[PDB]
């Protein structure tokens, strides 16, 4: 009688893109104090160059 439902693994939306976000899913130690997080192409990813 219970109902189960899972959050879908893949994204949903009109447009879906691949981006570069280092350690976006890291869980263990804090890691090196250095990251690279590009914004989605809808913004000005010019600060990274």
């Amino acid at each position: 009688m219970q109902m189960y439902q899972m959050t879908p693994p893949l994204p949903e939306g009109a447009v879906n893109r691949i981006v570069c976000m280092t350690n976006w899913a890291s869980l263990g130690d804090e890691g090196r104090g250095l990251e690279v997080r590009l914004p989605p192409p809808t913004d000005s990813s010019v600060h990274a160059y």
Partner: peptide
Amino acid sequence: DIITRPTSDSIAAVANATKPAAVVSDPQSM
């Protein structure tokens, strides 16, 4: 945060010297 450092002063000086105005008032566009 990201790693970034100021450019050498000499380069910045010469670079800033040559920067023409992008938009100017011209009374003609025909």
